[PDB]
Design a protein around this ligand. Structure first.
Ligand SMILES: Nc1nc2c(ncn2[C@@H]2O[C@H](COP(=O)(O)OP(=O)(O)OP(=O)(O)O)[C@@H](O)[C@H]2O)c(=O)[nH]1
Ligand SMILES: Nc1ncnc2c1ncn2[C@@H]1O[C@H](CSCC[C@H](N)C(=O)O)[C@@H](O)[C@H]1O
Ligand SMILES: [Mg+2]
Length: 260
């Protein structure tokens, strides 16, 4: 058994009060109070990201793990945090985002962040049955949590099988959420996809301790098993501390306004 399986089992055994004290202990968290207000007041020009996802992709882009450029396709775009962020980037020319929407799913939000006119978000799209398209940059942020690791395993494998089809359509840069990177079917599939397409797995420190999500990104490298175990050991070490401090707060991304 991978160390991550022990982590998931230990996580599920926490009391609710332990879980709540653990999930954000020592992580980085952007202050979203101003953005949440702007969403309630319909402020689309203040530069506030539509979701917490913008800060996560910004973290990866600023360290060179992915380099959005040209035509960007954003699979599972939700409200559009990754898509609007990419449209602010100089090398990016066009952004197409697809998301399922509907009951219990996030709907695309229309924003006027810098470059908004380059962004087309389409709701009502199940990407698992959508024909693939050409892109220069492929992003995918799909993976619904479950307390059952085999369910997270199956969901992650489906994303990987879907992104295999899209990666063969001319993709130069990519960033794909790996919801459950420690289970055997995911590790087997990731290793084959790393052999074919390269890249490596990274942990964004804005990810909460209540998940083991990692990102398979074209600008990273390194042994996948080692990368996963490193995360698992860090998450277990955090779980086994009693003196909790909550998150380290940082400033959210500013996306500006105006057309490009
Ligand atoms: N012990 C314990 N584990 C939980 C609890 N809620 C969720 N989990 C575990 O944590 C995983 C992530 O749950 P989430 O609800 O997505 O995590 P979260 O940090 O609470 O994030 P948000 O609910 O979106 O604010 C689940 O798949 C479970 O394995 C809980 O109340 N107690
Ligand atoms: N089968 C499917 N087809 C298209 N979108 C899906 C999907 N299953 C889940 N999703 C969507 O994928 C999204 C992942 S959340 C993505 C957050 C985004 N990166 C941001 O920054 O705002 C969810 O909104 C979910 O509704
Ligand atoms: Mg929760």
């Amino acid at each position: 058994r991978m160390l991550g399986e022990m982590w998931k089992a230990q996580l599920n055994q926490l009391t609710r009060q332990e879980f709540m004290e653990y999930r954000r202990d020592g992580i980085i968290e952007v202050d979203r109070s101003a953005a949440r207000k702007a969403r309630r007041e319909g402020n689309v020009t203040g530069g506030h990201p539509v979701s917490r996802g913008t800060a996560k992709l910004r973290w990866m882009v600023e360290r060179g793990f992915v380099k959005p450029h040209g035509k960007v396709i954003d699979l599972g775009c939700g409200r559009g945090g990754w898509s609007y962020y990419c449209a602010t980037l100089k090398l990016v020319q066009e952004v197409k985002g697809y998301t399922k929407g509907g009951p219990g799913h996030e709907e695309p939000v229309m924003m006027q962040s810098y470059g908004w006119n380059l962004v087309s978000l389409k709701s009502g799209v199940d990407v698992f049955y959508r024909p693939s398209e050409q892109s220069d940059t492929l992003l995918c942020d799909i993976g619904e949590a479950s307390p059952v690791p085999e369910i997270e395993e199956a969901r992650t494998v489906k994303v990987l099988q879907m992104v295999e089809e899209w990666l063969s359509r001319g993709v130069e840069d990519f960033c794909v959420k790996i919801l459950c990177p420690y289970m055997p079917k995911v590790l087997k599939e990731l290793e084959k996809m790393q052999l074919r397409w390269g890249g490596g797995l990274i942990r964004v420190p804005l990810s909460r301790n209540s998940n083991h999500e990692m990102y398979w990104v074209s600008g990273a490298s390194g042994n996948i098993t080692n990368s996963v175990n490193t995360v698992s050991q860090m998450l277990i070490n955090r779980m086994n501390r009693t003196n909790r401090n909550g998150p380290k707060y940082e400033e959210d991304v500013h996306l500006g306004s105006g057309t490009r």
